[PDB]
Every structure is written in C-alpha cells, then in structure tokens.
C-alpha cells in the first residue's frame, strides 16, 4: 500500500526539511526574556556543546562514513537529541535545552507516524567544510533505517512538494543495530548509489541490515533560486546588455518594494508599465516632479502612454480632505454623477394643488415625481462609513399657465429643446425642491408658485414639466 | 588595533573590489571625444600592451607562482601600473594611459593610508584560462606584503561588506624584497593554507619576508546574485512548476519595468496585485482592451477584485484636458465636492435691507452668510499652479413675506424638509449670489428681490433662510 508509504515519507521529509532549515540559519531568532533577540545559531558557536559542534569530515559522498559518536548525531528513540532542536518550553516547565526559538523548526513531539514505521531517521551526519570548531556544514546526510524503490519514489514525491531535492541517495548497511556501524553498501568496492540499485539488487545478502542515506546541501547558495528561498538585497534589469535599467529594493518597513531609476536613464522618471503587445502603446505608471500648494519641491504619479498623453484607469476613487467647515477632521467622497431630469406633470388635474394651505403630500406616491435607486457606496477605509448622497440644482424654470384650452405648453423634458415649447407665462413665486429617501429609493419632488395676471388667479403646481433640475449623486462621509 | 587594521582592510578591499570589477567587464563604457562609447576591455584585446596582456599560468591554487615580470603585474610604489587602471584625465592634462573610463573603478590617487601601512598590495596576478593573448582571466590573486590572523579577520569583514568573498588565502614568502621572489610557504611540501596556519606557526622561520595571497574569482555571471550585483534581462514567474507566469523586463528607457502576460495565460490581461491573505479578494491592477474617442484600438487599466468588479483606490486625482474655449492649452482639475447649504437670516431685523439703493455690503461680516475654509489644493506637475475654486448653484428659492405674526415661515436649511413650511409668497424678482474670498475663507452671500402684492411693498432680503444652494468646491488651473 503506497498511501501509507506516502504518509511516512511526508512526515520523514517534514522532519528532514525542518532540520535543513535549522542548519541554513547562521543567525536565528530566539526569545530571551520575552523579547525576540537574534543570536548566532548554536551550530556555529565554537563554545556550544554536544551535539551542536558535532562534525564528520567525509566531504566526498564516496568517502568512509564516520564511526565516532561525537561526529555524527544519533537520532530517534532512546535519544535525547530532539531536545536540542526544539524549543526549551515544549514542556511548560522547560527542557534541558537552552534555546527558545521564535518558531518551531520541527515539532517538539516526533510525528506519531514515525514512532513505529518501517523507515526511521536513525542518525544525522553534519559534513564539515573545514577543521575548525563550529565550522560550516556543506552537506547533511540522513541515514534512514529499514525496520526499497517504493519508498524512494515516495520520498522523492514528498521532497518535490516541500521545495527540497536530494544531492544523492545511497544504500547503506550495517552488521548490527548500532548507530556507529553504518557503512556504505559497495559493489566491487564502489559505493552503491540508489540509481544503481536496479542492476545490483541480486549481489546483496539478506544477512545485512540496510537503509538509505539521503544527502542534502543545506547552504542556501548566494544565488537566487527557483524556489525563491533567497532574499534579494536588490534586483536590477538589463538594457542592451548593461545593468542600466530600473531596480527594485525593499524599504525598512517590510511592506514596501521601491522602484528606482537606472544608471542609464537620462531622465529620472521611474515607471511600471503594462504591455499587451497588441500594437498599441504600453501604459505606464510614472513618478514625475511637482510642487505642492506652497510651491515646495514634491512629486506625483502619472498614468501615461508612450506619447506622454494621459491614460485611462477604471476604478472607484475616494478623495480625502479636511472638512471645509471644521478643520482637523477628514472627509471622504467619491466621484459624482450628473443626471438631467424634469418633473412630469402635464395636465391641470395633476398639476394644480387645489388647497395649498391644507395640502399634505406623499412624496412616495405623488404623481410626476423623479425616482431613483440608491447607489451602493464603494469600499472605504475602516471606521469611515460612506453614505449615499443626492442633490438637485435648478436647470430651467418658467411660470407657465393654462392656455385657451387648459393645457400647459412649456416643456423642458429634453435639454436639446427647452426653448422650442414656450408656453404662456405668468409671474414666478419660486420653487421648493425636496429630496427624501427610503431603504431603496431616492424621491425628488417640488412645489412651484405662479401668479396668472390674465385671470388674477394664483396657482401652486406639483412636479411640473416646467421645472427641470440637474441631479448630482455621490457617496460621502458627510451625511444627507 | 583592530580599528586601524579595519581601515587598512577596507582600503585594501576597495582596491581589490575595484580591480575585480574592472576585470569582470569585458565591454567597458569609455568616453571618446565628448561621448560615451562601448569598447572592448584592453585586457581582452590581443593588440594591447603591458600590462593589459600580462598573464600568469598557475591555474591550480597549489601550482608554482610565476617568476616572469611580463606575466605578473608589479603594483604600488615605484610602479607606473596604476595609470593603466584609472581614467586618462585624473590629471587635467592627461596621463600616459589611453582610456577615459566613464566610471572610477579605483580612485585615481591611491588611498593615502596604503602609502605607509603595514599591509600593502605588492603584486597582482591575472590567471589566464588558456594560452591566447588577451585571454579570459579566471582568477585574480593579490599578493599582500607584510611591512597574520588579525588582518585576515579584518579583510574578511571588509570583503563581506563589499559583496566579495575570497576563494582561498595562502601564505607566501620571499628571501629578499623582490616582487618576483614570491613563492608559496610550504609545510612538508604542502602549500600552507591559512586554515592550517594555526598548527604550523612554529615551523616557520623569521628569516623570510612573509605575506598573504588573496584569491578572488572574477565574474558572477549567468546566475542572479543575492546582493543584487547581477542584472536580469527579464524575470518570469512559475505556475505549477512551469514558466507560464507573467514576465517583467526593462524597456529601452532605463526608467520602466514592463509587465507582460505569461505563456500559460488563456487571456491577455496582465496585472499587478496586492493580497492581504485575510479572507477577501486580492486587488489587481489589470490591463484590458479598449477604444479611444475615434473608436481606434487602445487600452486602459482596471482596478478589480477576483470577481471582475471594480475596486477602490483612495488618492488625489488630477484630470488633464484641453480648454473647451482656447484649444492648444491644457488645464488640470480635481474631483469636486458638493455641499448643500442654506443662508440663515430668519427674522425681519436681519432679513430686510431697508434702503437697497444705498446698501453696501460687507460679505465678510454680514449676518446669515455662508462661510467656509479655503481648501488646500493637491500636488500638480511643475509649472501648473492650481487655484482653489468654489461655485454655487440654486437648489431652492421662494419669495416669502411676513406672515400674520411678522415671521418668515419658509426654511430650506434641511434638504429633506424644504416643503414643510410653505410660507406666504409674493412675486419673485430674482437673486444675486456672490462668492468672495480672503486669504483663508470663502464668503458666500446673496441678495433676493421680492414684491409683496398684499402690501404693494418692495422688499430686498439679505442672506435669507428660504434660499438654498449646492456649493461645489474643487481645484483647477482655471482661476476664480
């Protein structure tokens, strides 16, 4: 069953991956007296003790594996090794380890799947690059005891998923069950690598106890990697085979990437550009020189094509400014919309309000009204509730009266033709324009006073086709 | 003093780093009669002379160091060597060197500290990769004469701070004070590395003149480097272990990075995205197809979530367009704000202007006025002074008169209740609305004419509560 093998290999590679992470940190983030502190990894202090200083020297993958217990590191059951690679306070009391890492490299308790599995990490070798105490480790070999190509496929899959790869896989053997008895399995004096285990499986006696030695190369080499595990101090782009293009580097915050000019730029105007490569100009977001409201030196961003003409961005925009009434307070608003509209009462029955002093209206159901759906306000920063807003301004207004047939002729329903219907005008008293809202609708209503000097009769009109307004809608922190 | 040793090492590494940087440039930017031009490094012209063609042949770090003066390069006092690695016009008249580099690899005048320090660069070896004239150099060795573990610590610190690392450090000796007498210090026929000077210090006689040979490798090509000293032609990202993601490359300008679609994209809509990983959609700035005002093919940018809906950007926006009056001139504007407000004179004492023909207002101090703080305008590109603007449009107006109690009933202070007090209206003459400013304030005032037909009395009102306006505020290059 390979589904069980896959769990064992995922745990094994999880353990292997954590250990490599620990080796690959020369400075580790530790927790001394409640405040994170960076200290040198105990691996590279020539003052730390067993097992942090333990080193083997078989730099060659084909050299004889060590038989010294203070050179390799015995792992697993019966060993207190795990204490030295887990937090001091994996128990509430504190273990015998002296370090509280800011992060768990491996779980404090070994994965339960590995407690009785057929493949276990039995011993870990730290290959030293030189002969100084606390030297750098240039290869980590993991001896996994078998309690053979099925697991290698499974382990290779699990390592593929964890962004690690084996330098090589060797078959290792020992005559007993001691951690220092491990030697390389040999075919004619040549150590048997796993890739060559297909042809040499027959010349191996069942009298030995076998396992695999997985060799990794911890050092996260100074070069940027496909797995992205290299932090870049900066990165610059080439132009015509020279390092004269823009550069990206992080600022101190950890949140921001900063784009700066290259050495080849004759002008200092860095930009990010999008290109469809479909025959039109790329669009660039470029930083350019400016001046503030007090004529001091400043800068801004411009979205432009390759001709220097502004480009178009589709988005919701919020603008923040101090309230022009009370300063020291911020106000947010969106880009407004304008709709031209006139009211729609046309005949005398709907137009004339019979008893003005007594009339009590219902702007939700009055004839001739303007009705709109309440817009949805866009995203706003935390703690700034945006309210939908609406207002109306007078666009055209006349005091039209009944003609010889009791009909009203002045009509402003279409802006391109307001003067083409003239009407028979009286004296204007003015108009009262009101804006109300329910949960879903904006309601706009109006009242106009007119004196007819022909009949000396006073009329009050409701939502007339003689009055048209320009309606402005937006969202704002300033309520309605 | 490790403080004095550190300055010597910083100078030493500065020289070393500059020299190595020059070695690492096969094409160099030179200046020929006013203009920068690319020419082949004289090191790799089989037509250049001493010392550009000088090459040693000890490829092995353990091989015999050359003893031929036309193979190694003597450095320092008594040598004209430095001329050939600095600009021709480090002096105003011109030196015997033949090249004006566009940049100083090493300072023209040697760091003054190196003129008399205990450690000096005595000789520089250019290890050739083959036996052709002007061949590539595969290692640069700096022989430093002592005029031994203290300075190695300092030099390694200085090389760490200057983004270089030593391939290896050897101990060298000479029987006298010639630059060609340098040979490798040996213990039992084995060249003495510095990592083995701890155990063999006693078997070294003080009758020799000793020094260190620092070996630096030349290029850091092909692979991008963590310290960012390697430029990228482009960079593309992986998806599912394939190079199918977007690509960034510099355009010709030196200012722009250009984002383009990946090979795995089924649509051509490249985007830059932000993600908080806090449960909401990432926000993307994506380039999409569009059409201009002549319906010709074009493009724009869209700020959208993963659902294709517009997202919100909080920023100040400037829009540029040609003046709708005088073409050939460009004008800037900001996103406006709208304020609904009514004037506030309510009682007859404040409302009525007794002798209108004689009245001279003081719009700064008149009762009932609308007063606002002059807004601050945002940043604009150089040479485009923005002026604050304010305008008013009529929202509601009626020709109210005194009621039976001498009070004025119509009130438009609240848009949602403009019709709630009808008042007793006369005939309207109109209104004059004025906007003025001091250094800090907008002053909005108004005058309304009303004829009362009940009393045949002519009225002029100042800043009445029955007149309301929509105040629009913005910034523009078009003045007030």
């Amino acid at each position: 069953d390979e589904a069980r093998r896959q769990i064992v290999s995922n745990a094994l590679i999880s353990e292997i991956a954590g250990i490599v992470d620990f080796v690959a940190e020369e400075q580790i983030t530790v927790i001394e007296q409640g405040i994170e502190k960076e200290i040198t990894n105990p691996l590279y202090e020539q003052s730390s003790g067993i097992p942090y200083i333990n080193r083997t020297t078989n730099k060659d993958l084909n050299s004889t594996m060590s038989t010294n217990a203070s050179e390799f590191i015995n792992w697993g059951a019966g060993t207190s090794t795990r204490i030295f690679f887990t937090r001091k306070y994996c128990i509430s009391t504190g273990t015998q380890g002296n370090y509280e890492f800011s992060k768990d490299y491996i779980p404090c308790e070994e994965p339960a799947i590995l407690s009785n599995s057929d493949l276990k990490i039995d011993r870990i070798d730290f290959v030293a690059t030189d002969n100084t105490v606390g030297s750098a480790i240039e290869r980590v070999d993991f001896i996994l005891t078998f309690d053979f190509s099925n697991y290698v496929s499974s382990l290779e899959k699990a390592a593929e998923q964890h962004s690690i790869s084996f330098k090589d896989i060797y078959v290792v053997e020992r005559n007993s069950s001691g951690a220092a008895g491990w030697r390389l399995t040999t075919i004619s004096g040549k150590p048997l690598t796993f890739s060559g285990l297909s042809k040499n499986i027959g010349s191996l006696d069942k009298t030995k106890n076998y396992g695999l030695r997985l060799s990794i190369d911890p050092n996260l080499g100074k070069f940027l990697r496909a797995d992205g595990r290299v932090g870049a101090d900066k990165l610059c782009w080439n132009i015509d085979n020279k390092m004269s293009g823009p550069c990206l580097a992080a600022d101190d915050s950890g949140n921001n990437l900063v784009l700066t000019k290259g050495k080849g730029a004759k002008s200092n105007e860095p930009g990010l550009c999008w290109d469809l490569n479909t025959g039109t100009s790329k669009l660039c977001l470029t930083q350019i020189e400016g001046k503030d409201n007090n004529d001091k030196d400043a800068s801004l961003i411009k979205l432009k094509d390759d001709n220097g003409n502004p480009a178009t961005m589709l988005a919701n925009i919020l603008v923040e400014e101090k309230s022009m009434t009370d300063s020291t307070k911020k106000e947010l608003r969106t880009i407004p919309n304008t709709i031209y509209a006139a009211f729609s009462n046309s005949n005398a029955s709907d137009l004339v309000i019979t008893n003005p002093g007594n009339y009590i209206g219902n702007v939700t159901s009055e004839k001739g009204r303007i009705e709109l759906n309440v817009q949805d306000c866009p995203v706003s920063p935390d703690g700034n509730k945006l309210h939908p807003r609406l207002s109306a301004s007078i666009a055209s207004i006349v005091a039209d009266t009944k003609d010889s047939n009791g009909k009203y002729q002045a009509d402003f329903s279409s802006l391109a033709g307001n003067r083409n219907s003239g009407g028979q005008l009286g004296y204007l008293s003015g108009t009262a324009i009101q804006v109300n809202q329910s949960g879903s609708k904006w309601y706009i209503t109006a009242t106009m006073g007119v004196f007819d000097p022909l009949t000396n009769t006073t009329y009050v009109y409701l939502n007339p086709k003689f009055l048209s307004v320009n309606i402005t809608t937006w969202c704002s922190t300033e309520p309605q | 003093d490790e403080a004095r040793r550190q300055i010597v090492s910083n100078a030493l590494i500065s020289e070393i780093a500059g020299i190595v940087d020059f070695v690492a440039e096969e094409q160099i930017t030179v200046i020929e009669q006013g203009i920068e031009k690319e020419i082949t490094n004289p090191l790799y012209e089989q037509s250049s002379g001493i010392p550009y063609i000088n090459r040693t042949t000890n490829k092995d770090l353990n091989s015999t160091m050359s003893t031929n003066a036309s193979e190694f390069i003597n450095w320092g006092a008594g040598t004209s060597t430095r001329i050939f690695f600095t600009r021709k016009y480090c002096i105003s008249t011109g030196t015997q060197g033949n090249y004006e580099f566009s940049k100083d690899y090493i300072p023209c005048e040697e760091p003054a500290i190196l003129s008399n320090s205990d450690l000096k660069i005595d000789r520089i070896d250019f290890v050739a990769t083959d036996n052709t004239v002007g061949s590539a150099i595969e290692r640069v060795d700096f022989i430093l004469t002592f005029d031994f573990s203290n300075y190695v610590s300092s030099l390694e610190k200085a090389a760490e701070q200057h983004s270089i690392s030593f391939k290896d450090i050897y101990v060298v000796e000479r029987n006298s004070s010639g630059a060609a007498g340098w040979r490798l210090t040996t213990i039992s026929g084995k060249p003495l590395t510095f990592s083995g000077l701890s155990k063999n210090i006693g078997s070294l006689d003080k009758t020799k003149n000793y020094g260190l040979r620092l070996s630096i490798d030349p290029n850091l090509g092909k692979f991008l480097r963590a310290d960012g000293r390697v430029g990228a032609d482009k960079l593309c990202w992986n998806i599912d272990n394939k190079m199918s993601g977007p690509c960034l490359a510099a355009d010709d300008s030196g200012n722009n990075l250009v984002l383009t679609k990946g090979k795995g994209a089924k649509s051509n809509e490249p985007g830059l995205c932000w993600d908080l990983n806090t449960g909401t959609s990432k926000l993307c700035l994506t380039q999409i197809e569009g059409k201009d005002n002549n319906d010709k093919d074009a493009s724009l940018i869209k700020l959208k979530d993963d659902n294709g809906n517009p997202a919100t950007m909080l920023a100040n926006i400037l829009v540029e367009e040609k003046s709708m009056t005088d073409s050939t001139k460009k004008e800037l504007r900001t996103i406006p704000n709208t304020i609904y407000a009514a004037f506030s004179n309510s009682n007859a004492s404040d409302l009525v202007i007794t002798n209108p023909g004689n009245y001279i207002g003081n719009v700064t101090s008149e009762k009932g006025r609308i007063e606002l703080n002059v807004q601050d305008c945002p940043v604009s590109p150089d040479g485009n002074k923005l002026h604050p603007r304010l305008s008013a449009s009529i929202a509601s107006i009626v020709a109210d008169t005194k009621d039976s109690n001498g009070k004025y009933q119509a009130d438009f202070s609240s848009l949602a209740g403009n019709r709630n007090s009808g008042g007793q209206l006369g005939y309207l003459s109109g209104t004059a609305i004025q906007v003025n400013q001091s250094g800090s304030k907008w002053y909005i005032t108004a005058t309304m004419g009303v004829f009362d037909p009940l009393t045949n009395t002519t009225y002029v009102y100042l800043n009445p509560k029955f007149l309301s306006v929509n105040i629009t505020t913005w910034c523009s290059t078009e003045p007030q």
């Binding site: 209206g361 009262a432 009242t447 006073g449 004196f451 006073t458 409701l462 | 009626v398 019709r419 007793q424």
Partner: peptide, 11 residues
C-alpha cells in the same frame, strides 16, 4: 414622507 404647498397673496 411629507410635501406641502404655500399660500400666495391677492392685490
């Protein structure tokens, strides 16, 4: 909600 008219005068 509510909307109302207004009284006007006669000579």
């Amino acid at each position: 909600s509510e909307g109302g008219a207004f009284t006007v005068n006669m000579p």
